[PDB]
Amino acid sequence: AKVAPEPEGELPYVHPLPHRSSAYIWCGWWVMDEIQKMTEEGKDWKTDDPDSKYYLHRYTLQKMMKDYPEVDVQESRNGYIIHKTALETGIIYTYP
Amino acid sequence: GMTLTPGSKAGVFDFQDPIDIRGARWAGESFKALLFQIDKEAVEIARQTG
């Protein structure tokens, strides 16, 4: 509903992939765990917690899914490329 | 053509495209994707020139 406030610049690089209207960026396990922490108390990962210790990778992903309909974001725990609607929920594979 | 993965860019091998590198993580396995692509390309010469 709302817009995540803009945290200055230095946005992590998102690789354009017009081959399938997709995009690739390496986030890491800390973000994929943090966002997994985000969607467990009813909270939001698209725009909530603007003063986060790891807000930057969260803010870019939100714009990236708007720019690209089938984003391809890869973690490091297993290195899987979860897609845009696979990134929609915030629950990746397992765990509470 | 016959050497193309269906989700690739059909003429360029991209070291940042997970379809091109078959989901390889790290440089250590990202390069062997290029190796396999070179092999895949070579046989196509054998199929066309005979």
TrEMBL record, chain A:
<feature type="region of interest" description="Interaction with the major capsid protein">
    <location>
        <begin position="75"/>
        <end position="79"/>
    </location>
</feature>
<comment type="subunit">
    <text>Monomer. Interacts with the major capsid protein; one hoc molecule associates with each hexamer facet.</text>
</comment>
<comment type="similarity">
    <text>Belongs to the Tevenvirinae Hoc family.</text>
</comment>
<comment type="function">
    <text>Capsid decoration protein that binds as a monomer at the center of each major capsid protein hexamer once maturation and expension of the capsid has occured. It only has a marginal effect on head stability. Dispensable for the head morphogenesis and phage infection.</text>
</comment>
<protein>
    <recommendedName>
        <fullName>Highly immunogenic outer capsid protein</fullName>
    </recommendedName>
</protein>
